[PDB]
Amino acid sequence: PSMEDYIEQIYMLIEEKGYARVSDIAEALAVHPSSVTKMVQKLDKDEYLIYEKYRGLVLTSKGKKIGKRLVYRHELLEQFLRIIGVDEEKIYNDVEGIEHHLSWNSIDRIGDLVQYFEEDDARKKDLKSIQKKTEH
Amino acid sequence: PSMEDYIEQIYMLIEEKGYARVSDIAEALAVHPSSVTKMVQKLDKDEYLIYEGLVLTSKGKKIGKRLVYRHELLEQFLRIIGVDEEKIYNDVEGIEHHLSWNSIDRIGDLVQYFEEDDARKKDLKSIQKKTEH
Ligand SMILES: [Fe+2]
Ligand SMILES: [Fe+2]
């Protein structure tokens, strides 16, 4: 996975559990613990996290800000694909594939588009109309 | 670049020039010629193309056309929703081969949604002005 993938998962585990165990990270990302330990070393050098003797891995403010951004980006992209009518089963893998390869410009414009549909259900109905007309 | 990247570029070159030289592919993909020859052999095995130079099989032609369509569609998508033009190409290159066909087709419907009534485009721009502040 990418550095972004590791920070995203670490932030989520701290939110869910209160801590991020190397074993939990390894299971979440489907990687070997050694891959995790190496990435953690990298994230420590770049000051996204530190390692305490008693608490284990702890995000710095830099890590927390990035993690929160990454979770937001994930959730937004799922909401986007869901609103435009992608089969739910496909959404997660599509988001995992694209999320870390989009500019903030694109993310923010996708945010505006999500707001566009959420603000008036009639727009959703019209889009549903179009889909039927592109079905033939 | 992936297999999809190689076929997409090979198809474009045949459409542009009438042929696909290894050197043109290597230049388009910012890779060494040897990487190209390796992929070409893989593509020849999978029956996407043959060498007689490089010629796409019907399988390769169908895939290449799908890939250019997907590219062009995703650029139009980002453009319609107001992404800065200078960002669109790199964003598409990054996402294009990681989307299901379901997502591509739904994005296609969304593009048609906006292109059919210019007022929808105006309303989206209105929201961007709200979400700005
Ligand atoms: Fe994610
Ligand atoms: Fe492309």
Curated annotation (Swiss-Prot), chain B:
It is found in: Cytoplasm. GO terms for molecular function: DNA binding; DNA-binding transcription factor activity; manganese ion binding; protein dimerization activity. It comes from Bacillus subtilis (strain 168). DNA binding is strongly activated by Mn(2+) and Cd(2+), but it is poorly activated by non-cognate metal cations, including Co(2+), Fe(2+), Ni(2+), Ca(2+) and Zn(2+). In the strict absence of divalent transition metal ions, MntR has a low affinity for DNA. Homodimer. Cd(2+) 1 binds at D5, E93, E96, H97. Keywords: Activator, Cadmium, Cytoplasm, DNA-binding, Manganese, Metal-binding, Repressor, Transcription, Transcription regulation. Contains an N-terminal DNA-binding domain and a C-terminal dimerization domain. Contains two metal binding sites per subunit, site A (corresponding to metal ion 2) and site C (corresponding to metal ion 1), which both contribute to the metal selectivity of MntR. A large metal cation is needed at the A site to correctly orient and position the C site ligands. Smaller, non-cognate metal cations bind at the A site, but disrupt the C site, blocking the full activation of MntR. Binding at the C site also favors Mn(2+) and Cd(2+) over other metals. This is HTH-type transcriptional regulator MntR. GO terms for cellular component: cytoplasm. One of its GO terms (biological process) is intracellular manganese ion homeostasis. HAMAP family: HTH_MntR (MF_00732). Pfam families: Fe_dep_repr_C, Fe_dep_repress.
